[PDB]
Amino acid sequence: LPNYYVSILEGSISPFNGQLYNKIALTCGMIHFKEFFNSEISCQGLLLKLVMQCALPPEFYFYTKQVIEFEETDIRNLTLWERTDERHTGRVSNHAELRVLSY
């Protein structure tokens, strides 16, 4: 293997500033994870970790989802985004996992 290909395989620096999200956007753009697979983030299994992360009362698990359900597209389905478009990183917070944190 060459000196650059054997340096790209060892992961010297871990993904930062949303580097890992933007690679999913390229991955959902070269192959269509949309329209073939269920691009539905299990957002109920996300917040249960986020409930037990900082020891908040479990009332906030259902205080959150009604805020999510009120401000959402078709109530449910925080759909995972695709980018076949270009080297432009959507600043819309199009990433479905990124949207649950702001809620």
Partner DNA sequence: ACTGCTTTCGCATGAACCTCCCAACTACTTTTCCTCACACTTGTACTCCA
Partner DNA sequence: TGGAGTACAAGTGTGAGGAAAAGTAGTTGGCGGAAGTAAAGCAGT
Residues forming contacts to DNA in the complex (CB under 7 A) are 1, 3-8, 10, 12-13, 17-19, 22-23, 26, 86-89, 92
Smallest distance from DNA to CB 82, Å: 14
CB 41, CB 96: distance < 8 Å: yes
When the beta carbons of 22 and 64 are compared against DNA, the nearer one is: 22
DSSP reduced 3-state for 40: strand
Distance CA 14, CA 103 (A): 26
Helix ranges (H only) for the chain are 5-9, 19-30, 43-53, 59-70, 96-102
Smallest gap from Cβ 75 to DNA, in A, equals 22
Minimum Å gap between C-beta 3 and DNA is 4
Nearer to DNA, 74 or 85 (CB): 85
